[PDB]
Design a protein around this ligand. Structure first.
Ligand SMILES: Nc1ncnc2c1ncn2[C@@H]1O[C@H](COP(=O)(O)OP(=O)(O)OP(=O)(O)O)[C@@H](O)[C@H]1O
Ligand SMILES: Nc1nc2c(ncn2[C@@H]2O[C@H](COP(=O)(O)OP(=O)(O)O)[C@@H](O)[C@H]2O)c(=O)[nH]1
Ligand SMILES: [Mg+2]
Length: 349
RNA sequence: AUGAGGUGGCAAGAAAUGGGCUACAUUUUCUACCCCAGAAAAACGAUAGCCCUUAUGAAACUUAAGGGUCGAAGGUGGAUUUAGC
């Protein structure tokens, strides 16, 4: 196999080859966001070989040819269910992290808009709501991912947490992040502050921010959360959602924004719906317009053959008839070269 | 008048019994979806009780639907017994 960890080597000629994430990179760059099925696959194989695909290569080429002076260009990976949008976004995230960018990764925007029973009224803004658990978990993950720049960045304004507690201007962003992580009740606010800070620092040229949000359509969709009066809650009424909406605006420069659509886990969306407009909604498409959509599709014959060979070399296909050409054709037909269906099918052979 | 007509009224539970529904959950519950999800998990569980509204009606206390409230018995059940090629 092409067991390669260098992100500056793989290119169009490496389409179909493999790209290895080292265990240190797996632990640091990806404390979250990796699909659970691939998390299990990594934990079993003891490897993190991502197949290099054309959409990921195109996104990498665009990010290499971009200029940070320009306002943040929005890229949107989209495709059919289980085509590899999340893992393409993860590949781009890892490449950018190795490029010493600052990775602002959202593992799943759907989690913040569904199944939350610890919602509280926001002290900073009585018209909004706070999700302490989600914010605390994301703050921990963000501190893990971007530790090296966490202390270097200086905050630009003084922020207050209580009548007694406040964060002074010029303090490290690590102070705010650790305040959010430890003091869970304020964590949501800290999240917004961090985002705000990052944005202006991106404008200041302090670093090269890469905003990575999976399931971006959840920002402008619908939330299943309810009020204390059993009333539905609009997405903008959540502080985290509003802050992420502000971050999605292209009114800042110093990097680029990369998002991945995901009907899986979305609310009030038909199963077969995958197109950008249908998943995003009119408001979502208007907010994201303009953007560059990148289509992620099923494996080609070369990619499917490479995946099958990778499974065989790891002895995952334990069935006796799997190495035969007939078994390969059966798997290709029953999966239609779809990466998720193929992996799920091979998980029990 | 053992005929005819009008007004009003029963119909409850000590209790046993037959049949049915819902369940006693994790192959489950909630939500989206209508099958690649996220949560819940000592909660699961009433179509019961009480209150309110609505529908029908001349009339609802006695009907039905919905909502609020309550969250109980129950934790896969003896001999026996039903049905299905
Ligand atoms: N480049 C790749 N190399 C190896 N496996 C891949 C690749 N892309 C996708 N997969 C497989 O796809 C599955 C996960 O799919 P993924 O989450 O990336 O796609 P998706 O369409 O964005 O998903 P979802 O709609 O659920 O958000 C895993 O089983 C993983 O092995
Ligand atoms: N607790 C606290 N939170 C802050 C402070 N400053 C900013 N924030 C957070 O950062 C966000 C501020 O966004 P802001 O720039 O005011 O956007 P706007 O509300 O639309 O004007 C809010 O969601 C707060 O949670 C502060 O001084 N204290
Ligand atoms: Mg009588």
């Amino acid at each position: 196999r092409t067991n390669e960890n260098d992100p500056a080597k793989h290119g169009d000629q490496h389409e179909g080859q493999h790209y290895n994430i080292s265990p240190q990179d797996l632990e640091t760059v990806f404390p979250h966001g990796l699909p659970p099925r691939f998390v299990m696959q990594v934990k079993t194989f003891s490897e993190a070989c991502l197949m290099v695909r054309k959409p990921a290569l195109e996104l990498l080429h665009y990010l290499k040819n971009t200029s940070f002076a320009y306002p943040a260009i929005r890229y949107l990976l989209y495709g059919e269910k289980g085509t590899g949008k999340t893992l393409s976004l993860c590949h781009v995230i890892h490449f950018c992290a190795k490029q010493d960018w600052l990775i602002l990764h959202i593992p799943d925007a759907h989690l913040w808009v569904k199944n939350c029973r610890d919602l509280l009224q926001s002290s900073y803004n009585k018209q909004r709501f706070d999700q302490p658990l989600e914010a605390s978990t994301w703050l921990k993950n963000f501190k893990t991912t971007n530790e090296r720049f966490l202390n270097q960045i200086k905050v630009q304004e003084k922020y207050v947490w209580n009548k007694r507690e406040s964060t002074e201007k010029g303090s490290p962003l690590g102070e705010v992040v650790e305040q959010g992580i430890t003091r869970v009740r304020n964590a949501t606010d800290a999240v917004g502050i961090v985002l705000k800070e990052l944005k202006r620092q991106s404008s200041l040229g302090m670093f090269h921010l890469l905003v990575a949000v999976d399931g971006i359509n959840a920002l402008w969709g619908r939330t299943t959360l309810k009020r204390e009066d059993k009333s539905p809650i609009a997405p903008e009424e959540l502080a985290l959602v509003h802050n992420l909406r502000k971050m999605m605006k292209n009114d800042w420069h110093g990097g680029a924004i990369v998002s991945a659509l995901s009907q899986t886990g979305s609310l009030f969306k038909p199963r077969k719906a995958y197109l950008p407009q249908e998943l995003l909604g009119k408001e979502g498409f208007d907010a994201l317009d303009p953007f560059i959509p990148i289509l992620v599709s099923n494996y080609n014959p070369k990619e499917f053959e490479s995946c099958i060979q990778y499974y065989l070399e790891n002895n995952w296909l334990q069935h006796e008839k799997a190495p035969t050409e007939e078994g390969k054709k059966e798997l290709l037909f029953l999966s239609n070269a779809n990466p998720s269906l193929l992996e799920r099918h091979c998980a029990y052979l």
